Amino acid sequence: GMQTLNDIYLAYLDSLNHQAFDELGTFVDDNVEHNGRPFGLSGYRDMLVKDFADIPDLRFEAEILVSDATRLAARLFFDCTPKSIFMDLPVNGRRVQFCEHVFYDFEQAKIRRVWSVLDKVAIERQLG
Amino acid sequence: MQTLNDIYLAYLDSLNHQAFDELGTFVDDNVEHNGRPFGLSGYRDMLVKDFADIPDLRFEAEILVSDATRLAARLFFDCTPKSIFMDLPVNGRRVQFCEHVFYDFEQAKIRRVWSVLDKVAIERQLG
C-alpha cells in the first residue's frame, strides 16, 4: 500500500548499500543537518563517501524502526571491517560489530535533520 | 487510554525523584537491558548505582518517537559524575551528553531496552 516514512527509509538504506549517491537527493533535503553540522546534501554525500572509503564492506541494516508522521528512530547494526582508524580507535582491518542509534526529522518525504550516536564502547571492548 | 509517551514521562518523573519502590509500575519483572536479562531488581540496582555515581543526574527527553509497542528517546544529560564514568576520568567535572534508547513495552511496562550513550561527546569535553 501507500508508502510511509518506514518505506522511504528502507529505500534510502538500499541506495546506500548500492552506494547510489547520485540518487541521494531523492531521500535527503538540500539543507540537511547531521549532528548539528549544517553541511547540506553535498556535505552529507561526502560523509557517506568517506564512511565507505574507511569501511569498504559497510552495509546498512535496521534492527528496530520506530516512526510517526514526521520522525523516524533506527537501531542499525553493523558487522564490518574498518581499514584503519575508526572513532579514533586503531581497528586496523579487524572485523567489529557495533550499533548506531539515530533520529531523523523528515520534511516533505526527505531527511532534514539527523541526530546519531555510535556505540564506541562496543568497539573498545572488541579491541581491548 | 494511556499512551506510551505518557507512561514514559511518568517513569522519568519517578526516576528524577529516585522513587525506586515504585519502579515495577513502569518496568517488567523480567526486564532486559542491553542484552542483560537482569530483571526488575537488576534494573533498580543499575539506577541506584547511576545516582550514586552522578548525584545531580536528571532525566529529560529532547525527542520522543513512539507507536503501539515501542518508544525511542533522545535524552540529554547535564551532570557531574564523581569519578570514572564510561572509563573516562570525569572526576567531578560537569559534562553534557546524550543517550539514544529504544524500549519494547509489554502490558504498559518496559520489557526490553537498548541504550547507546555518546562517549565521544564526553571525550571532547575532557580532551
Taking the C-alpha atoms of A14, A17, A23 and A24 in order, what is their torsion angle to the nearest 10 degrees?
A: 90
- Do the chains contact at A68 and B65, CB–CB below 8 Å? yes
Amino acid (one-letter) located at A62? A
Of the partner residues B71, B74, B118, the one whose CB lies closest to the CB of residue A103: B74
Please give the DSSP secondary-structure letter assigned to residue B18.
T
Interface with B, mutate which of A101, A113, A114 (most B CBs under 10 A): A101
Q: How far apart are the first and last CA of chain A?
A: 48
User: What domain count does chain A have?
Assistant: 1
- Do the chains contact at B63 and A72, CB–CB below 8 Å? no
The C-alpha cell of A109 is what?
518525504
The number of beta carbons lying within 10 Å of the beta carbon of residue B43 is: 23
Amino acid (one-letter) located at B56? D
Alpha helices in B34-118 (DSSP H): 39-53
Q: Write out the DSSP string of chain A.
A: ----HHHHHHHHHHHHHTT-GGGGGGTEEEEEEETTB--HHHHHHHHHHHHHHH-TT----EEEEEE-SSEEEEEEEEEE--SSEETTEE-TT--EEEEEEEEEEEETTEEEEEEEEE-HHHHHHHH-
Q: Which domain holds residue A127?
A: 1-128
* Cβ–Cβ under 8 Å, residues B61 and B77: no
Query: Nearest CA of chain B to the CA of A104: how many Å?
Result: 10
Contacts of B58 (CB under 8 A, 6+ apart): B16, B77, B78, B79
Q: What is the CATH number of the domain that holds B77?
A: 3.10.450.50
- Do the chains contact at A68 and B67, CB–CB below 8 Å? yes
Query: B101-127: b or e for each residue (b if 16 or more CB lie within 10 Å)?
Result: bbbbbeeebbbbbbbbbbbbebbeeee
- Do the chains contact at A117 and B118, CB–CB below 8 Å? yes
Chain B residue with CA closest to A119: the answer is B116
Technique that determined the structure = X-ray
